[PDB]
Design a binder for these strands. Structure first.
Lengths: 184, 317, 500, 475, 493
RNA sequence: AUGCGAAAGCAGUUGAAGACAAGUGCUUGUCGUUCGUUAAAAUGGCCU
């Protein structure tokens, strides 16, 4: 009879929880520079630039894995913090995306198409401290994280690769800095 | 208007007839990128204070460069502008630049596919003209040299890898009123390369004067002797020069006036000899305004004031 | 300096100040060229291009106080044109939401904070949100009855946004403000901007009505009074910019807020009439003269009462005859044609004046069969066939002080065909009230005997309005608009595949 | 037309077309049934594509080049797979193929037989009494490659193991241009420039039918079992006959006629259609060199039909970052008033020596000058007598005119206030008598509201002024 | 990005009787020209076809004036006694003239030498002579013999048709648009009569009771007539045979009347009445006959006319006064080698595929004060606002917008007495008003807050402050008296 | 400056620890530090 639904997304989902990083921008331009990916509050949007138009709206809700992760109705502590272009698993693959959240979940999805309900999901361990940043050279990736034992945060830098076995993520201690004030 | 024609021998069918508004097109030029090699642009400009860029099929993409970030006080116009590649020497990211004439000795240089102001150099007197040459160094590394002619005949040669540092000056022999320069024999603004390896040093250098005289130099020894003598001195025409264009391969020099009918000549290099049979008294030119060569087909294209361009295939190439 | 950025090689400096201007500094000759106005202040900017085709930048919209609403912008750097503009829908709330921090600056105002005040205000807001039992988040949201757009009233601004495509389609200012003339810095920041507070449509949609108040500067002789301005706009059926057609200075004497505004039914003048009621008891009916070009007073009724209700409302019969003028606690029913009390020859205890318990928040009529009234403690459903109450519902558990007087109007809405929609909202406590919220929706029939449908939503709901095509739309605090309602082949694939 | 030659592949999904560019010919392939860049240039500058044909696992084509060569061109990799070489240097007049046996006809009047599988020249060859040869084909008798056809202006049918004419038919005036087998006993022929397609029956040797075109004939295609014949006619038209082998019936006119015209009304030509049963595939040239397609259903087509397209003729360039005019979308319409009427909130509308005769005269009429003089009188006693003399409706009209003159010229409110004081002294009876005080005295009510509620700001300013005044002129 | 917003001038709400658009146009009629003639002017008309001509009758002297020069071009004086009525023909080539000796004289214009035809009607004075409108060869004369005659201009010897039954002194007549057979006559005792010609014609079809003596009548539309009689004037409906309006909006008897339709102006159809008291008033029949504009001439106006609807020249409004006065008011209205060398700019781009414009919409100027404001130099902004020959509205909108945006103190700190003074003078005036007086009260308040030390130091301002003490006390007495007269009107309710 | 209230106003609020900097263990001042409650400054202004 009467049914309730969530239709239109809202806020464009800043990196406010950090508030110490000097580059809050999360959205990213694709390899082929015809399209642009925006991490919203309840969805992830695909825009085609030369028509200024939305094309695919990867909603968090319809996907069970995301809905079992991203709309946890006790706290939305887990939020998206980094987007990477290709496939972290194997290099030289097309229309793929890796999403990196606040708590140790790493997802691979694939826009430009009927997104199959088989998200390539992995968990990066040692989640007693929460993820701060992720970036990359060719192949050798680095992870910034936020630790504490005076009302500041310690930053740990870790090195990262893939596939010891499929799930075992090669996070290793690189360095640590004691209490950051401002960073970029 | 910009009109783009596809060329047969037997027909010439109109690809596109783009028409702008309020912009008298004084100079237009193709430009293909180098690294991506799938990016194509058309630049046009006149005596306004902007510059139109058309990208490369029902509704086209056109931007207008307008802001010289530091100084509009020099160049109140865009009447003379060419395009050239430039290598960065830190990153190997060769990119396209547009060079603009200016006020007194100001040549300004704008990074093209950004719209940025990269660098400006200046000589004194009154800049009449300028052109581009290259020099390869190593496997895919090469420096671009800008050549500029004052009215009096003080040729400057600058380079552009490091910022504007005068390589050298010299003075053309004679040369009262200089009114066009062009290099040739290799790559240029009309015969550009398509990938970085084929960039070849230009050999011949042409200075077209106000009389009709054309001084013609060899670079390989001109650069040495540093106030050098001409390889030769053409003295055919009786009026001003306004178009000097080299072959793709470096043999043929087309010179062209702008003031009387049928005022074009062809000069065969290295003899610096005027051709004799062509053109005759039976070839329709009118006031020649615009010459253009082909890359590899062997075509010469000539426009004029009446509006009718004409083609001439060299059966040799 | 709120954003710094470098060009790719190391020759240009993108500067991101408060003043709404993004500045490029060419370092070499040390000169600057800059983009002057960008709809707010710039938190972030950087260069994304493989050579530098694109600047990315992130805007704050600092004019909105209660909720920091950010916007993504992508600029082609050749023209400096807005190649891409992305923004979610923009509300404005009565009070600030859970733990947002206005950015840093040099001074303090009601739009910004100095550093010490920043930390102290973060703690102060969290503590007050736990402590104070007053808070509400009640905004006004409109629906275009021929375009199905949503008209969010920003301060001094209007956002036209449709939720079929989930993309903003227009942004405008509607106020004699300082909106783009100058980016504010310090005392210009302590200055406050003229606020749209009421916005409604005519049912034909070809006459938009708005009402904005404007404030004075500080510390002058005339800083004692405020100024209220009424405005009537049109537009065509295809344009997307509104043309102002009549602006009215100071309705209802001087310094009197217009408190409730009403769009007339179709039946009177093809929906070209409006009702304005002040806070003392007056009525005015304005409309559109067509042999003039304009809007005028059609009828007045101004008592001079020296008591003031902050909370009024009024509703109108569908046959254009019965005007339910609800002041605080004592309703009246008037005949429209004389604006005086319904004087009966029958006198059968359906008398024109009604008394209820406490201050009346919102009256509607669902048909000409039932008048639905909401006061500060309960909700009552009364007949019009007979001067007698029908249904009563106790609410003083919930609506205690949790709504500033006059905002259950923007809570309760109804269809004109089936029923009415009631709202309850509770903060999810632990044992102390926590920050988090929760919401309950009721769907009532015209008789209000049975709840036609109950629903729960896990977050705070700010506003439910009714869609003319028989459904309901609602705005959530996290701005998520929700609804309540009913050889050859292989070769073919390969052809699509395609230093010495 | 700038397409030098073109040919569909059988089962109609691709066309190969050869054109010129800077006087070097290039060949390219494009699909039709739903742009492409892999073109092939011929590196020599004197050669021309002289004939073109398809073959089907690598789908490939065969190009006869007037240098004297026949190239087999792979279409997947743009590479010249093989180079069949005549033992001569002339033009290949024509090519044809079946199974893997292939026969080509040479401009010095020569026959050649090759095989594809062996890449090999089987037999160089000649016959007699055939002085020019510019079309040939082979009948599809089965795998048996017997009795092929050659023609220049008189079609001739020849054996292989007997290598002689057996039936010779009187062809056309022009050299023939189009020569195809429909059924194993019937072939169609149409020369260069004539408008008649002759349907020749082999075994009787009889000119069984003629089809007339409307104009000169350029390209010919036909259905499976003579179910339909499509003709691309040089002025740019597609004409189809239904059932040529059915039966005043020695000639057959065109059954249906199709042209292409865009929105502009200029007539885009048509080249080289292709037909199957119930499916017609028409092509044309959109830009100067690129071909576009359409499919359509000929049995649903009426007799004369004009396929439309949306061709760019005077498109305003309504780009992505632009407004309806001027602005970019991320801006805002900035607020500008323009021409709105501004009213206040209290403008109630739409709800003994006397002079009384001259005032009442001007006010019955509407006389600025006389009203000006009768108010330019100044004596209070004169005022008293005259307003005691006046008639009430004229007192009402006096009140409105008076308030008007004040509200424009504020200086006069000093002297003129005695009248509006004195008007209400006397005619209070009739003023009480009229109902609509507010709408009868609209302007006066407004102006008094103005000054009266302005007052307190003036009070505050007077106070602070006097404070300063005393403070400095006491010392 | 965006563009800058232009500042708006503070449009304060309107006080009654705004400048109506009709008043704009009908005062664009300007430039009073006076020419003194011999004696009173009876009748004035304009040529129909090329409307560049208009004729005026007088005491025995007909004058033709022309529209280009507004001057006398031609003179008709071949008459014996007083000519009454001259008109042009509907085709324009010919004109008729009616005298008091008992005859009309008709001849083509521009040539007084050739009396083309001379018809002797009744020996009574022929009062008015006109032509048909639809027909072109039938002329009508009303003579004072209470009978009007239709002379067919071929056989001028006898009246082609009489028209009798009138009471006394037929002084006007008009034809009718839809019909060429239906003729209206205005007597001098009322009874505006309506006759047929395709009947026998001795008796009228019917009449109308203008109970005053009718002074003019005009076919305004092929279903409506207007009548000028006595003080008022009226408009009658033909089919219902029943008047639709009366407008009694005059002082003496209305004398002359004219109607005009569909020209280029913000009003559709104009009706001019000229009413013997200087007063010429234009109404419009589409606004249900209300007054729209009116001028005053000293003497009584006897005739008035407008330039016709196909004017195409500078339009005329002609008024004729009994003192001898024609008063007019008139709304007025390289090298060949070079061009071949650069002839390209004038092309517009017709037969090209894709067209794009992008140049700016070239705005109005920016005033120097606006440049001052947008470049923030606020003291210079105020001084440039008090440049002497400026608009008062400009000065107000300057101070209003500065007071909204920035700070009057930061625009007032760098001050001395010698630049304090002009602002103070403008306050000294602008406090007298209202709409200025509020804002300028704020400003005088803040400057008196600031500069008291310089006040007691300097004597020039002490002069200005004592006068300002008077003016506010003078102004407060005015607004204090305002409330008494407002509350007094409450007592009348 | 919070609560209540109409645009009037009507009541109340401004308190702790820490750590550091300067002047001479003492005074002031500061807080990218915590508790507790209804709580102005580096001549530096808007594109074509």
């Amino acid at each position: 009879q009467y049914k309730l639904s969530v239709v239109s997304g809202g806020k464009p989902a800043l990196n406010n929880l950090s508030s110490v990083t000097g580059n809050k921008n999360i959205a990213r331009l694709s390899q082929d520079q015809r399209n642009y990916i925006i991490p919203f509050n309840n969805q992830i949007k695909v825009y085609s630039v030369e028509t200024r138009q939305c094309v695919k709206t990867l909603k968090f809700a319809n996907n069970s894995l995301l809905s079992g992760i991203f709309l946890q109705e006790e706290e939305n502590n887990e939020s998206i913090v980094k987007i990477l272009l290709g496939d972290i698993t194997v290099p030289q693959q097309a229309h793929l995306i890796t999403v990196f959240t606040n708590n140790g979940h790493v997802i691979v999805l694939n826009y430009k198409g009927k997104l199959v309900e088989s998200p390539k999901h992995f968990k990066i361990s040692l989640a007693d401290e929460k993820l701060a940043n992720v970036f990359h050279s060719e192949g050798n990736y680095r992870i910034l994280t936020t630790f504490k034992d005076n009302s500041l945060q310690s930053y740990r830098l870790y090195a990262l690769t893939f596939d010891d076995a499929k799930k075992q993520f090669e996070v290793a201690h690189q360095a640590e800095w004691h209490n950051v004030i401002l960073s970029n | 208007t910009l009109r783009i024609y596809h060329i047969d021998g037997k027909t010439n069918h109109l690809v596109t007839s783009l028409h702008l508004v309020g912009s008298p097109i004084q100079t237009c030029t193709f430009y293909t990128s180098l690294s991506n090699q799938n990016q194509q642009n058309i630049f046009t400009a006149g005596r306004r204070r902007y510059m139109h860029s058309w990208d490369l099929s029902q509704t086209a993409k056109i931007e207008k460069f307008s802001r010289l970030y530091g100084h509009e006080s020099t160049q109140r116009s865009f009447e003379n502008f060419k395009v050239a590649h430039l290598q960065n020497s830190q990153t190997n990211s060769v990119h396209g630049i547009v060079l603009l004439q200016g006020n007194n000795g100001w040549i300004n240089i704008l990074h093209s596919t950004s719209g940025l102001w990269l660098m400006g150099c200046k000589i004194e007197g009154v800049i009449t003209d300028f052109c581009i040459d290259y020099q390869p160094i190593s496997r895919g590394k090469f420096r671009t040299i800008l050549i500029a002619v004052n009215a009096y005949g003080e040729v400057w040669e600058f380079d552009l890898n490091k910022n504007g540092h005068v390589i050298r000056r010299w003075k053309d022999q004679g040369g009262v009123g200089i009114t066009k320069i062009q290099v040739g024999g290799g790559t240029t603004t009309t015969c550009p390369a398509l990938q970085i390896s084929k960039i070849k040093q230009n050999r011949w250098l042409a200075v077209g004067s106000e009389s009709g005289f054309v001084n013609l130099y060899d670079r390989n020894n001109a650069m040495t002797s540093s106030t050098p003598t001409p390889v030769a001195a053409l003295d055919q025409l009786t009026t001003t020069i306004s178009n000097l264009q080299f072959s793709p391969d470096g043999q043929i020099l087309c010179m062209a006036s702008r003031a009387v009918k049928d005022a074009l000549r062809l000069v065969h290099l290295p003899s610096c000899s005027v051709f004799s049979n062509w053109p005759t008294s039976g070839t329709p030119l009118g006031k020649v305004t615009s010459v253009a060569f082909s890359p590899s087909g062997g075509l010469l294209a000539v426009g004029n004031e009446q509006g009718k361009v004409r083609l001439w295939k060299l059966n040799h190439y | 300096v709120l954003s710094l950025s470098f060009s790719h090689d190391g020759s240009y400096l993108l500067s991101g100040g408060w003043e709404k201007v993004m500045s490029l500094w060419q370092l070499e000759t040390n000169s600057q060229q800059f983009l002057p106005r960008l709809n707010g202040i710039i938190i972030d900017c950087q260069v994304l291009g493989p050579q530098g085709n694109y600047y990315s930048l992130i805007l704050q919209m600092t004019e909105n106080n209660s909720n920091s609403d950010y916007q993504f912008l992508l600029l082609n750097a050749s023209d400096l044109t807005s190649k891409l503009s992305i923004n979610g829908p923009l509300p404005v709330f009565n009070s600030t939401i859970k733990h947002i921090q206005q950015p840093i600056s040099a001074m303090n105002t009601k739009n910004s904070n100095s550093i010490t005040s920043l930390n102290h205000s973060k703690k102060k807001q969290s503590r007050k949100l736990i402590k104070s039992r007053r808070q509400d988040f009640t905004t006004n949201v409109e629906i275009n009855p021929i375009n199905k757009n949503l008209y969010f009233p920003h301060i001094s601004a209007v956002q036209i946004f449709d939720f079929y495509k989930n993309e903003q389609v227009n942004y405008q200012y509607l106020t004699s403000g300082v909106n783009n003339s100058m980016g504010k810095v310090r005392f210009e920041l302590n200055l406050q901007d003229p606020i749209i507070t009421d916005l409604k449509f005519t049912k034909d949609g070809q006459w938009m009505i708005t009402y904005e108040i404007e404030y004075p500067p500080n510390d002058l002789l005339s800083s004692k009074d405020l100024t209220h301005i009424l405005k009537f706009w049109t537009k065509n059926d295809n344009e997307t910019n509104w043309n102002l057609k009549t602006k009215v200075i100071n309705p209802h004497g001087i310094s009197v807020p217009i408190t409730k505004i009403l769009p007339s039914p179709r039946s009177v003048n093809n929906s070209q009439g409006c009702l304005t009621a002040d806070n003392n008891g007056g009525l005015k009916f304005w409309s559109f003269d067509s042999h003039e070009s304009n809007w005028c007073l059609k009828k007045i009724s101004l008592p001079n009462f020296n008591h003031f209700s902050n909370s009024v409302s009024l509703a109108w019969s569908q046959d254009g005859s019965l005007i339910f003028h609800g002041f605080d606690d004592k309703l009246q029913i008037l005949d429209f044609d004389t604006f005086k009390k319904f004087e009966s020859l029958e006198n059968t205890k359906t008398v024109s004046e009604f008394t209820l318990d406490s201050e009346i928040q919102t009256v509607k009529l669902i048909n000409d069969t039932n008048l639905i009234v909401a006061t500060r403690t309960t909700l009552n459903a009364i007949n019009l066939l007979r001067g007698q109450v029908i249904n009563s519902f106790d609410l003083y558990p919930f609506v205690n002080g949790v709504y500033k007087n006059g905002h259950m109007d923007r809570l309760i809405t109804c269809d004109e065909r089936t029923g009415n929609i009631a709202l309850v909202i509770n903060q999810q406590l632990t044992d102390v009230p926590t920050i988090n919220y929760k919401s309950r929706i009721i769907i009532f029939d015209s008789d209000l005997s049975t709840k036609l449908g109950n629903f729960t939503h896990h977050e705070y709901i700010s506003w439910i309005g009714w869609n003319y095509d028989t459904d309901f739309i609602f705005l959530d605090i996290e701005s998520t608009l929700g609804v309540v309602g009913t050889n050859s082949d292989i070769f073919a694939e390969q052809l699509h595949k395609l230093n010495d | 037309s700038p397409v030098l030659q073109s040919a569909y592949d059988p089962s109609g999904q691709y066309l190969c077309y050869v054109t010129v560019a800077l006087d070097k010919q290039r060949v390219g392939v494009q699909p039709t049934q739903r742009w492409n860049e892999n073109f092939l240039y011929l590196e020599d500058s004197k050669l021309k594509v002289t004939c073109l044909k398809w073959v089907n696992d690598t789908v490939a084509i065969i190009l006869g080049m007037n240098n004297g060569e026949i190239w087999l061109y792979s279409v997947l990799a743009n590479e010249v797979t093989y180079k069949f070489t005549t033992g001569n240097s002339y033009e290949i007049k024509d090519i044809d193929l079946m199974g893997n046996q292939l026969w080509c006809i040479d401009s010095s009047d020569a026959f050649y037989q090759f095989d594809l599988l062996q890449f090999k020249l089987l037999q160089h060859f000649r016959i007699n009494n055939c002085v020019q040869l510019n079309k040939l084909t082979i009948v599809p008798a089965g795998d048996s490659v017997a009795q092929l056809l050659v023609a220049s202006h008189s079609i001739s049918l020849i054996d292989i193991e007997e290598k002689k004419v057996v039936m010779t038919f009187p062809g056309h005036v022009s050299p023939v241009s189009t020569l195809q087998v429909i059924t194993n006993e019937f072939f169609i022929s149409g020369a260069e420039g004539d408008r008649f397609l002759n349907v020749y029956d082999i075994h009787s040797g009889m000119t069984k039918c003629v089809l007339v075109a409307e104009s000169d004939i350029k390209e010919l295609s036909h259905s499976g079992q003579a179910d339909s014949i499509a003709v691309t006619t040089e002025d740019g038209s597609l004409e189809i006959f239904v059932d040529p082998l059915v039966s005043g019936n020695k000639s057959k006119k065109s059954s249906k006629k199709i042209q292409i015209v865009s929105k502009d009304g200029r007539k885009v030509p048509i080249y080289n259609a292709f037909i199957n049963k119930d499916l017609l595939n028409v092509s044309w040239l959109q830009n100067a060199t690129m071909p576009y397609f359409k499919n359509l259903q000929w049995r649903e087509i009426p007799n004369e039909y004009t396929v439309e397209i949306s061709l760019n003729w005077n498109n305003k360039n309504k780009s992505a970052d632009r407004d309806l005019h001027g602005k970019d979308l991320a801006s805002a319409t900035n607020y500008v008033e323009g021409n709105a009427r501004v009213t206040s909130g209290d403008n109630f509308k739409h709800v003994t020596g006397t002079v009384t005769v001259i005032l009442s005269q001007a006010l019955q009429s509407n006389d600025h000058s006389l009203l000006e003089t009768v108010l330019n009188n100044r004596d209070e006693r004169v005022i008293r007598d005259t307003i005691f003399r006046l008639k009430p409706a004229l007192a009402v009209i006096l009140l409105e005119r008076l308030a008007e003159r004040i509200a424009r010229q504020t200086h006069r409110q000093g002297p003129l206030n005695v009248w509006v004081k004195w008007c209400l002294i006397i005619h209070g009876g009739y003023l009480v008598s009229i109902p609509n005080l507010m709408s009868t005295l609209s302007s006066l009510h407004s102006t008094l509201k103005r000054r009266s509620d302005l007052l307190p700001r003036l009070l505050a300013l007077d106070a602070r002024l006097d404070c300063t005044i005393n403070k400095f002129k006491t010392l | 990005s965006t563009a800058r917003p232009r500042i708006i001038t503070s449009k304060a709400p309107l006080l009654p009787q705004q400048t109506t658009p009709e008043q704009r146009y009908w005062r664009q009629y300007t430039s009073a020209q006076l020419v003194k003639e011999h004696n009173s002017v009876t009748h004035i008309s304009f040529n129909p076809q090329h409307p560049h001509d208009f004729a005026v009758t007088s005491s025995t002297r007909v004058q033709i004036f022309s529209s280009r020069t507004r001057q006398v071009i031609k003179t008709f004086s071949r008459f014996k006694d007083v000519v009454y009525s001259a008109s042009f023909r509907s085709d324009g080539k010919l004109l008729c003239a009616g005298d008091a000796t008992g005859l009309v004289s008709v001849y083509d214009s521009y040539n007084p030498r050739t009396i083309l035809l001379s018809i002797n009607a009744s020996t009574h004075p022929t009062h008015v002579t006109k032509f048909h409108t639809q027909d072109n060869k039938i002329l009508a004369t009303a003579s004072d013999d209470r009978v009007t005659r239709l002379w067919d201009i071929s056989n001028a010897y006898e009246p082609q048709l009489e028209l009798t039954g009138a009471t006394d002194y037929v002084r006007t007549l008009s034809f009718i648009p839809a019909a060429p057979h239906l003729v209206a006559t205005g007597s001098y005792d009322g009874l505006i009569r309506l006759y047929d010609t395709r009947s026998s014609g001795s008796t009228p079809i019917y009449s109308l009771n203008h109970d005053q003596p009718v002074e003019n009548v005009i076919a305004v539309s092929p279903t409506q007539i207007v009548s000028c009689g006595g003080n008022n004037f009226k408009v009658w409906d033909l089919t219902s045979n029943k008047k639709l309006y009366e407008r009694g909006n005059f002082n003496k008897a209305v004398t002359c009347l004219d109607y005009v339709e569909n020209f280029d102006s913000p009003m559709q159809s104009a009706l001019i009445a000229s009413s013997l008291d200087g007063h010429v008033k234009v109404f419009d029949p589409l606004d249900n006959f209300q007054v729209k504009f009116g001028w005053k001439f000293s003497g009584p106006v006897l005739s008035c006319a407008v330039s016709p609807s196909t004017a195409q020249g500078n339009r005329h409004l002609v008024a004729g006064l009994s003192s001898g006065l024609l008063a007019i008011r008139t709304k007025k209205k390289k090298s060949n080698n070079f061009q071949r060398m650069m002839r390209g700019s004038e092309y517009q781009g017709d037969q090209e595929h894709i067209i794009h414009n992008d140049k700016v919409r070239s705005q109005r100027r920016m005033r120097a004060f606006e440049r001052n404001i947008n470049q923030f130099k606020w003291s210079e902004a105020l001084d440039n606002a008090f440049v002497p020959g400026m608009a008062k509205e400009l000065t107000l909108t300057v101070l209003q917008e500065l007071r909204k945006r920035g700070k009057v103190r930061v625009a007032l700190y760098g001050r001395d007495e010698s630049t304090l003074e002009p602002l103070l003078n403008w306050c000294l005036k602008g406090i007298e008003d209202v709409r200025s007086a509020s804002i300028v009260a704020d400003w005088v308040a803040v400057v008196l807050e600031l500069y008291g030390n310089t006040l007691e130091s300097s004597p020039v301002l002490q002069e200005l402050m004592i006068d300002l003490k008077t003016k506010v006390r003078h102004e407060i007495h005015k607004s204090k008296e305002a409330q008494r007269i407002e509350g007094m009107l409450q007592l009348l309710t």
